[PDB]
Amino acid sequence: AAHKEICAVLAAVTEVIRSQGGKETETEYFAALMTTMEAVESPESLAAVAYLLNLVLKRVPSPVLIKKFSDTSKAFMDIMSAQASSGSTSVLRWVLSCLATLLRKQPVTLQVYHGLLSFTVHPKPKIRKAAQHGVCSVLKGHPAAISTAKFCIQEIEKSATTTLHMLTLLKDLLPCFPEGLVKSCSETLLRVMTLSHVLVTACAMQAFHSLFHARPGLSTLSAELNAQIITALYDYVPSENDLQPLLAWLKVMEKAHINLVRLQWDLGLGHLPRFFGTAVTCLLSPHSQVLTAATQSLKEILKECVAPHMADIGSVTSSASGPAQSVAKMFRAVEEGLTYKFHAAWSSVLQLLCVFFEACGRQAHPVMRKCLQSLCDLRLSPHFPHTAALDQAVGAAVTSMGPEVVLQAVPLEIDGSEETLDFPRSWLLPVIRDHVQETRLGFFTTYFLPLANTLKSKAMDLAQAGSTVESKIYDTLQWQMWTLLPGFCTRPTDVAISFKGLARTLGMAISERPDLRVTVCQALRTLITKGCQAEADRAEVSRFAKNFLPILFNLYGQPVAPRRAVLETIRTYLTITDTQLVNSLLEKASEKVLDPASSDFTRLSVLDLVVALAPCADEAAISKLYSTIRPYLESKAHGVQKKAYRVLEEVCASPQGPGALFVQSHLEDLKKTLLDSLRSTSSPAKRPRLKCLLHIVRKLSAEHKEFITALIPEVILCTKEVSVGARKNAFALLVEMGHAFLRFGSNQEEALQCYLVLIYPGLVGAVTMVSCSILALTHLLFEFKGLMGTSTVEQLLENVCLLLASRTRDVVKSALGFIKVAVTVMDVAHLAKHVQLVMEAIGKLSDDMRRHFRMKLRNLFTKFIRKFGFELVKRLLPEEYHRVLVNIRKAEARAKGDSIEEILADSRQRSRAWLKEDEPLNFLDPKVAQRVLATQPGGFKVSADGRLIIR
Amino acid sequence: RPSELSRMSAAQRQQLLEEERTRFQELLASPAYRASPLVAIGQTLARQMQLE
Amino acid sequence: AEFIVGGKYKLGRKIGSGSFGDIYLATNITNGEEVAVKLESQKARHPQLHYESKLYKILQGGVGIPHIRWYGQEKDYNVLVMDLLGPSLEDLFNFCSRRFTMKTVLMLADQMISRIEYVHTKNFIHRDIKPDNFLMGIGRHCNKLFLIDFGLAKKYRDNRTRQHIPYREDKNLTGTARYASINAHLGIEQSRRDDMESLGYVLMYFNRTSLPWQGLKAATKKQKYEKISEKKMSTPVEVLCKGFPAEFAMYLNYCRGLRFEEAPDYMYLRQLFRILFRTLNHQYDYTFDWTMLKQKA
Amino acid sequence: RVRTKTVKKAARVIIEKYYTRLGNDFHTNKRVCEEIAIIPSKKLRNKIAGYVTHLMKRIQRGPVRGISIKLQEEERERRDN
RNA sequence: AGACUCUGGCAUGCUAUUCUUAGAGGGACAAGUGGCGUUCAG
């Protein structure tokens, strides 16, 4: 009862009692309480003053401590000797703690440190733990490290349960030791590793983990010492499958290798192949946890210790000498880790090979090919579960190099005329499509142009030959290798010289080859989206853009086709081109629109081209186009007005450039035109127009309040427009006009009050515009939450209560939405004044309105029960609602890969293997793993016409 | 004159927009709606609903 | 609604603050009778409400003690709910524009003598006697005084072995120093003698309507209490009741000279008070100053 | 929007029956759903066409060996009758 | 925090028919794009 009090020693003694006499701190308290410390052994009085001394002693009387450190050392030392002769715990524990504080703050000091250190082996846990933590705080808060290291060495050599205790000391204190003492400590630690006791082994592996995890400097640990302790630690490797000490052995060897690489990288990479070979051998253990740990450790070493030095190492071949030869050796180890003897870790081995590819491939490709051929052979097994992982690995290797080196290693056997129909390496084309990102385009030209052309010719020739089965297969093939162009267009290294060889080919393939067009368009977009980083590349793209523009315009403007992908390609492709030919094509498109001999579909297509060309032109062409399009805002055709408003939105969309200059030059003209064309705007044309108004609200000057207050009713009636996009644009425009009035005055709250009283009268007139203004206030209440002033919100809420009595369902629904938003937003302390009125208006709603709007009333009652008492809501509702309430309360009681067959699916254990028995099974054959599997081998009513019946 | 805007014609949309714009202009030019806006709104709503 | 105590009492508004809690009003939802609420926080500096419950259930039956209604623990608090009572004596002191008459103070003196008789026959001391601590009844209890707030109460005698708490010096001033005793000021263990010395102090507070050490200011609380102490020894007994009957003076002299283990004759004090009451020719008609200003309105 | 069990079941069986005669876009799929299936509901016809279009845009991105062996298996079944 | 049933906007189309009709047939299926996504559900 009296420890939890604020006045107790728990809180206030730590704060205000340290200020002794008004100034913190004075040891005159301690200088007066020597008389209790001497010749008095009363329990619970020495312990309490020792507790207070320990608590107050941390508040830095440091020069006084340096002065009377001799007096304190003698006093607490005689206390130590007397209490050791007597044998108490609490007084001894807090005198250990306060001596620890004194030694942390500050010849005889070595004696005090020895006296503090000698009580670690004291058998009582409270004494031992306090002494250990005090020694750790003193050393980490050093000239005394040699003495305590020698003390730990002699204490180990003297001794069996205390061995674990100063091993805990070693675990907590190894980083703060000198190098020779670290060497002697590790020699003694391996001496106690000569014993077969398990707990000492686990604790001293934890000591190694704490030693290597802290990443010590050169003074604490040298590289030669790290290499020696790494070579010494190889002698234990407990058996194969112990999984408690093998985990620690792998972890400390990982940390030691990381520290060795951090000190001297070449020696660390030189010592890595032995550890990688032992890890690959340890991957044959039947335990899954050690397999995951070995995979994670080798992945960490590959990512942090192997990857960043490969620019220094360079390319490795079969005749490497330095660290490159070590990289080749540990690659040889991970390649040997792919044989038939594993057959259960192939998921982990393939994942680690995948990160190996990603880290290593660009310099390790000359030796990389045999592993690629072997893993290609592994997919030829009848039943493979790691097909997705194998495809990820092949994609990682392709991402490392590209298809040229891979096809040198594993060639495609679809080169022209084949005999059978079962392509064994057909997964390579999806892999190449999914994972080519850093290749050269010239290889794509010189390999995939003639091969795909010959396969397309063969497909067509077999199509006229009657065989419609093989022709479809070859057409799907040529489609698949024509989808590699977006992959090749990701980040090419020679797109400044190889794009000249594909311009006319891509033009004809987008002109008279529809079956590729979308992908071709995507390829163009993909290229642009990440390929115009350099300037010569963008110059080449413009130099062929001047030819590609008529082709794309004629493709989009033709009658019927993937017009929308062509339009997106045109949009980006015109954002990356020069302005003069944009002006020329804008003039030609204006000529085509103004030509009366054009059809309506052609006119709309050229208007879409005008929309695309509008933001990319200069200010004079934009002004001329705006003058041409300005009479079209009153056209009776909804499509023409929609395209006109889209043009006006697109020219106002650019925040900088000729569009912004045109807006600044023609703001008054645009304002009077948009105010004049407000009366004759069609329903689809509301959707872009608001956005255009949006684009002229963001940069509107202070002398424009009349324009906004004239636009307001249109924006509200568009918040209840038919189109969801128009409603979204109107809500965004209301928010943006609210933001625009936050810039015209000094007081934000008064400006928001003005904006609200400019939109308030909509609660007065017709029913649909009343619901319009309720929805507008509902949207605005969620955005400017406290800024209008909650009391005004309360008044608005009261008004909504009157609108809760409306006959029309739309007004009631909008009022319920406003009530939900108000409950969410404004404060519960101000809700509690207004719960009764709003929920009384809820209560006398109707029978029909209550029955129809049961979801919203249920959610509102749930929110009110969450925010207030359940008994209050029960008291103020009428009878029937109470039923729903208890259900709500019961509710609150209850609240506390790409194959055909896999896609067409009706949607200890992993170590199992199946042999197969043909020639006799030669286990020593390099191609034996193909015959060792990892998985188990092996409705409607048709009518008389034959058509199926679906119901 | 249906309340739902999705089922009713665009000419009547224009007529309703013009009528509500004129009503907004008249209510904004009214001296009663210059000193106590929300009080006048509450009185008008109370009158309109006691009519109903 | 927002909070229900006991399952059948609905809480109302605050009426005051106790020594170890806050005082609220509540209405019973079953029958409609009105009760008073003492609420305290379950984690605080003084968890003494269960001792208060024990002292209230000890003091039941006799006159001048409100009857116990309920006690319990409510989700962050401990709440003890009692019968409703009226204002304290200081509220009537404020309402009467700071003036008391001879008849009214002898009514109050007889009532507090009876209260002190009851509490020392129930083997407990108060140690925080003040006009705020004595409440007035309601309804037919409108002529009966009531004693509350056993928070600072303690045991002063044993039922079996007839032994007092042993005397020992240096006791902190638990109650208020406006009516604390000289023995309470020094640190002498408080007994019944200090209790009716505090009764004499509140009596002279009611008579003189002011204290010479009221509103005294010093360096700190301890210095204030000490200064009040030596100016209390510096004040003669007879000068405190100049122009007044000597009954109060020799009452103070009698209660000052009482020993520790003695048993005072309270019948003697009641006899002397009623002799003075009948020699000034008044009758027990219960017509108090607050009552007559209610009928005057 | 979510898709019911009968739509995906009928789509899977219609793939397994007539993958050969299908197309790649919503037009050809709704046409072959008109001329292959009875499908009295136009709503369910649009749903089945959309989901078989989703199946098409999923499955020609896979390896061609499975689709190829499906073609000669379907050709063998058709030639058998 | 309704994956229940039916269903509207547009037809210068068929039916006695571009302005009024009332039967049928179309049209919308998340169909297309870009990001986030277990790379598939969303």
- Domain positions in chain D: 1-60
Cβ-contact C55, C127 below 8 angstroms: no
- Residue A23, classed as helix, strand or coil, is strand
The Cα–Cα gap between C88 and C131 comes to: 7
The Cα–Cα gap between A525 and A576 comes to: 11
- Packed helices A658-665 and A638-653: angle between N→C axes, nearest 10 degrees: 110
Whether nucleic acid strand E comes within 7 Å of the CB of D54, the answer is yes
Method in brief: cryo-EM
Distance D44 CA to E6 C1' (A): 14
Residue for token digits 């928070």?
C151
For residue A891, give every residue at least 6 positions away whose Cβ sits within 8 Å of its Cβ, in sequence order, or none: A862
Binding residue per annotation — C20?
yes
Sign of the dihedral through C-alpha C71, C73, C78, C84: negative
Taking CB atoms and an 8 Å cutoff, what residues of chain A touch D53? Answer: none
CB environment A405-433: b (16+ within 10 A), e (fewer):
bbbebbebebeeeeeeeebebbbbbbbbb
Residue C86's nearest CA partner among C39, C129, C143 is: C143
Q: Which long-range contacts (CB under 8 A, 24 or more apart) does B22-31 make?
A: B23/A761, B23/A764, B23/A765, B24/A712, B24/A713, B24/A761, B24/A762, B27/A761, B27/A764, B28/A709, B28/A758, B28/A761
Contact A713 B3 (CB under 8 A): no
A737: amino acid identity, one letter: M
Residue A867 falls in which region: left (phi positive, over 0), alpha (psi -120 to 50) or beta: alpha
CB of A804 within 8 Å of a chain B CB? The answer is no
| A472 token code pair | 């479809």
For residue A940, give every residue at least 6 positions away whose Cβ sits within 8 Å of its Cβ, in sequence order, or none: A948, A949, A950, D10, D13
- Residue A320, classed as helix, strand or coil, is coil
Cβ-contact C276, C102 below 8 angstroms: no
Residue A757's nearest CA partner among A766, A749, A767, A769 is: A749
In terms of CA atoms, which chain C residue is nearest residue A2? C45
Q: Which long-range contacts (CB under 8 A, 24 or more apart) does A743-751 make?
A: A743/A702, A744/A702, A744/A705, A748/A787, A749/A787, A749/A788, A749/A789
For residue A455, give every residue at least 6 positions away whose Cβ sits within 8 Å of its Cβ, in sequence order, or none: A414, A416, A474, A477, A478, A481
Residue A48 falls in which region: left (phi positive, over 0), alpha (psi -120 to 50) or beta: alpha
**Which alpha helices (H) appear in A677-785, and where do they start and end?**
686-695, 705-719, 724-740, 748-757, 767-781
Whether nucleic acid strand E comes within 7 Å of the CB of A866, the answer is no
**Break positions in chain A: residue before each gap, C to N over 2.5 angstroms:** 106, 141, 159, 560, 896, 907, 917, 938
CB of A835 within 8 Å of a chain C CB? The answer is no
Residue A47's nearest CA partner among A3, A81, A79 is: A79
The Cα–Cα gap between D55 and A70 comes to: 86
Whether nucleic acid strand E comes within 7 Å of the CB of A897, the answer is yes
Topology adopted by domain D1-60: Diphtheria Toxin Repressor; domain 2 (1.10.60)
Contact B28 A758 (CB under 8 A): yes
Contact A473 D71 (CB under 8 A): yes
How many Å separate Cα A319 from the centre of its chain?
42
D38: amino acid identity, one letter: I
| A59 token code pair | 């508040």
**Could you give the maximum distance between any two Cα atoms of chain D, in Å?**
41
Cβ-contact A606, A592 below 8 angstroms: yes
List active site positions of C: 128
Cβ-contact A544, A577 below 8 angstroms: no
| C190 token code pair | 């408080």
Cβ-contact A814, A774 below 8 angstroms: yes
**Which alpha helices (H) appear in B1-52, and where do they start and end?**
10-28, 37-51
The Cα–Cα gap between C278 and C276 comes to: 6
Count of Cβ atoms closer than 10 Å to residue A156 Cβ:
20
Angle at the Cα of C167 from the Cα atoms of C163 and C172, rounded to 5 degrees: 125
Tell me which residues from 5 to 24 on chain B have a beta carbon below 7 angstroms from nucleic acid strand E: 6-7, 10
Angstrom distances, CA of residue C213 to CA of C172, C188, C223: 19, 21, 13
CA of B5 vs chain A CAs: smallest distance (Å) = 7
What is the enclosing helix (H) or strand (E) of A243? none
CB of A871 within 8 Å of a chain C CB? The answer is yes
Residue A644's nearest CA partner among A674, A618, A667 is: A674
Residue A914's DSSP bridge partners are A933
**Break positions in chain C: residue before each gap, C to N over 2.5 angstroms:** none
C22: amino acid identity, one letter: D
The Cα–Cα gap between A35 and D77 comes to: 108
The Cα–Cα gap between A446 and A490 comes to: 18
What is the enclosing helix (H) or strand (E) of A584? helix A579-594
- Residue A942, classed as helix, strand or coil, is strand
The pair phi, psi for residue C72, each rounded to 5°, is -170, -175
Distance A683 CA to E7 C1' (A): 22
Cβ-contact C8, C28 below 8 angstroms: yes
| A191 token code pair | 């001496």
3-state SS string for A421-463: CCCCCCCHHHHHHHHCCCCCHHHHHHHHHHHHHHHHHHHHHHH
| C41 token code pair | 């926080």
Residue A660 falls in which region: left (phi positive, over 0), alpha (psi -120 to 50) or beta: alpha
Cβ-contact A95, A80 below 8 angstroms: yes
Resolution (A): 3.1
How many Å separate Cα C67 from the centre of its chain?
17
The Cα–Cα gap between A248 and A792 comes to: 66
Q: Which nucleotide is nearest, taking the CA of residue A892 and each C1'?
A: E1
Give me the DSSP letters along chain C.
---EETTTEEEEEEEEEETTEEEEEEEETTT--EEEEEEEESSSS---HHHHHHHHHHS-SSTTSPPEEEEEEETTEEEEEEE----BHHHHHHHTTS---HHHHHHHHHHHHHHHHHHHHTTEE-S---TTTEEE--GGGGG-EEE---TT-EE-B-SSS--BPPP-S-----S-TTS--HHHHHTPPP-HHHHHHHHHHHHHHHHHSS-TTTT---SSHHHHHHHHHHHHHTS-SGGGGTTS-HHHHHHHHHHHS--SS----HHHHHHHHHHHHHHTT-------HHHHHHHH-
Binding residue per annotation — C125?
no
Cβ-contact A53, A30 below 8 angstroms: yes
CA of D50 vs chain A CAs: smallest distance (Å) = 15
The pair phi, psi for residue A702, each rounded to 5°, is -70, -30
Contact B42 A805 (CB under 8 A): no
What is the enclosing helix (H) or strand (E) of D4? none
Residue B43's nearest CA partner among A763, D75, C192 is: A763
Contact B10 A683 (CB under 8 A): yes
Binding residue per annotation — C41?
no
The Cα–Cα gap between A135 and A147 comes to: 12
Distance A255 CA to E41 C1' (A): 40
Angstrom distances, CA of residue A686 to CA of A514, A580, A640, C118: 35, 32, 13, 89
Angstrom distances, CA of residue A337 to CA of A324, A332, A650, A853, D57: 20, 8, 59, 66, 38
Contact A4 C1 (CB under 8 A): no
- Residue A565, classed as helix, strand or coil, is helix
CA of A782 vs chain C CAs: smallest distance (Å) = 28
The Cα–Cα gap between C78 and C71 comes to: 8
The Cα–Cα gap between A404 and A441 comes to: 11
Residue for token digits 């000057």?
A701
Taking CB atoms and an 8 Å cutoff, what residues of chain A touch B31? Answer: none
Angle at the Cα of A150 from the Cα atoms of A146 and A156, rounded to 5 degrees: 150
For residue C208, give every residue at least 6 positions away whose Cβ sits within 8 Å of its Cβ, in sequence order, or none: C240
My answer on whether omega of the bond before D20 falls inside 30° of 0, hence cis, is no
The Cα–Cα gap between C258 and C246 comes to: 19
CA of D6 vs chain A CAs: smallest distance (Å) = 8
Cβ-contact A543, A495 below 8 angstroms: no
Count of Cβ atoms closer than 10 Å to residue A681 Cβ:
24
Residue C55's nearest CA partner among C128, C142, C111 is: C128
* Strands ordered across the beta sheet of C9-18: C4-5, C9-18, C21-28, C34-41, C77-83, C68-74
The Cα–Cα gap between A377 and A179 comes to: 52
Cβ-contact A257, A230 below 8 angstroms: yes
Taking CB atoms and an 8 Å cutoff, what residues of chain A touch D41? Answer: 950-951
Count of Cβ atoms closer than 10 Å to residue D45 Cβ:
18
Residue A711's nearest CA partner among A724, A728, A698, A730 is: A730
